[PDB]
Every structure is written in C-alpha cells, then in structure tokens.
Amino acid sequence: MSLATILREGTSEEHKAAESSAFIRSFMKGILEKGTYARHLEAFYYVYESMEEELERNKNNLVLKSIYFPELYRKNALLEDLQFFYGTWKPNDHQPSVATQDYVQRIRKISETQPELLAAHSYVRYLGDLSGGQILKKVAARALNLPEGKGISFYEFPMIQDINGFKQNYRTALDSLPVNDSEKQSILAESKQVFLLNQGIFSEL
Ligand code: HEM
C-alpha cells in the first residue's frame, strides 16, 4: 500500500524511542543548555551537509526525481544558527563526533550503492523538520531565552509559504515514487536505521 502510510505506521515506535535521550526529554520540558544545544546543531550540520551533497548528486535518479525538494535543505540554516551561538563557527575546531561520523558514512555509502534509500533519509529528517519546526522553534526560543528571530533558522522554511500544503504535497510525492511494495519495505528498513542514527547523535549530548 501507500509508501507515506507504510513509513508513518512502520516508524511510530522509533519516533517515540528517539526521545529516550535526556537531551530531548529536557528540550521537551522547555530546558536547554547553550553549549549542549550548539553541539547538537554541529552534529546536524555534518548530517545535512552530507545528505544535501548526496541528494544533489542523485537528483536525476528515477526514483528520487519526484522528491527533489531543495526548499527543505538545512545546511545553510544550520550554519546561520551556529554563527549565532558561536560568534564564529570553525568546523576544524568542531570536527564531527563519533556518532555523527557513522551517520555521515551511512549517508555516503547508501548514496553510492542504493541511492533510492535516500528517500528514507529525506522522510525521517525533512518531513520531521517540516512537521515539528513551528513547535520546536518556540520551545527552543523559550528554553534559551533567544532574541526575536535569532538562532532558530533551522526550524524555518522561507521557501515554503504554505507548510500544510507542502507536507501534503510531500506525502503525495512519496506515494508517487516508482517503487514496488518490496522496495517500499527496504525504504521502511532504512527509515528505522535513520531513527537509530539520530538516537545515536542524541545519546552523545
Ligand atoms: C529524532 C527525533 C525526531 C525525528 C527523527 C522526527 C521525525 C518525524 C517525522 C518523520 C514525522 C512525520 C510523520 C509522518 O507524517 O509520517 C514527524 C512528525 C512529528 N513530529 Fe517528529 N521527529 C522527531 C522528534 C520530535 C520532537 C522532539 C518533536 C517535538 C515537538 C516532534 C514532533 C512531531 C510532531 C508534532 C509531528 C506531527 C506533525 C503533524 O502531524 O502535523 N518530533 N516527526
């Protein structure tokens, strides 16, 4: 049946388990520490930089073509938030953590061997970002007592003026992917792995 439905129903438990980290529990209670939050953005910087490198590389893949959504890219939003927190963010002074490196390796290796599985990476990260952004930006601003419009670029999509319409269009796009039900199962298996890789980076904080 529907790939968007398969992924939603198939990853409901993984979404819940990704909050077993104390970083996320406190974030959900409205508690964040500046230093820890900034390291959390560093891990996402490396992840999205790699994912966007690989999605651009595979943009004309027949399966990925209909989910070519540069509107969702986060690398530049992350850089901007990193500059707000650090003043000047030097990547060589803040090299990727062990869990970040394993996540980037997964992205790279998937891109070169099974690029259709990058659909799982797009789903887990971007559809989550679009779904949670408005809520998470308010929680983060309140937790860190942030100035108006600063340090929350990661949660904002200036290229998308209708978030609700885009989320619907995204799920319709997932359902349009030219993949069979067996291939959708492989996309679900990858999505579960992505949730685990996110739990891995959260575990470090
Ligand atoms: C690893 C952490 C997380 C990942 C990978 C993630 C991923 C996702 C994904 C992929 C969806 C889309 C589900 C679907 O429509 O099929 C989603 C939905 C959602 N997520 Fe998360 N999520 C995470 C954590 C959080 C956190 C911390 C919040 C706190 C607000 C949150 C709030 C939501 C909400 C409210 C939705 C549903 C939005 C809607 O239906 O309008 N998530 N998430």
Side-chain angles (χ1 to χ4, degrees), residues 128-195:
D129 297 335
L130 198 58
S131 308
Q134 291 306 104
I135 294 163
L136 290 171
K137 75 186 199 188
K138 293 204 180 202
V139 169
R142 170 164 67 244
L144 293 166
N145 197 4
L146 296 179
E148 189 60 52
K150 296 269 215 277
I152 56 158
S153 183
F154 177 58
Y155 308 107
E156 304 193 323
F157 298 85
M159 296 182 170
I160 301 167
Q161 294 82 49
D162 177 11
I163 299 160
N164 188 64
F166 199 99
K167 282 162 59 190
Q168 292 168 345
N169 287 4
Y170 184 90
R171 298 183 81 239
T172 300
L174 285 180
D175 289 349
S176 85
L177 297 198
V179 292
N180 61 38
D181 290 333
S182 178
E183 292 176 310
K184 292 170 193 177
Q185 283 300 304
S186 295
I187 297 161
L188 175 58
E190 192 62 13
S191 300
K192 292 174 179 272
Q193 254 304 286
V194 183
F195 272 102

Side-chain angles (χ1 to χ4, degrees), residues 8 15 18-19 24 28 123-125 127-128 131 135-136 167 171 195 198 202:
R8 174 177 286 178
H15 187 277
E19 296 132 28
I24 306 291
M28 291 309 96
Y123 169 80
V124 178
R125 285 314 316 174
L127 189 54
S131 308
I135 294 163
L136 290 171
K167 282 162 59 190
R171 298 183 81 239
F195 272 102
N198 277 274
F202 299 155

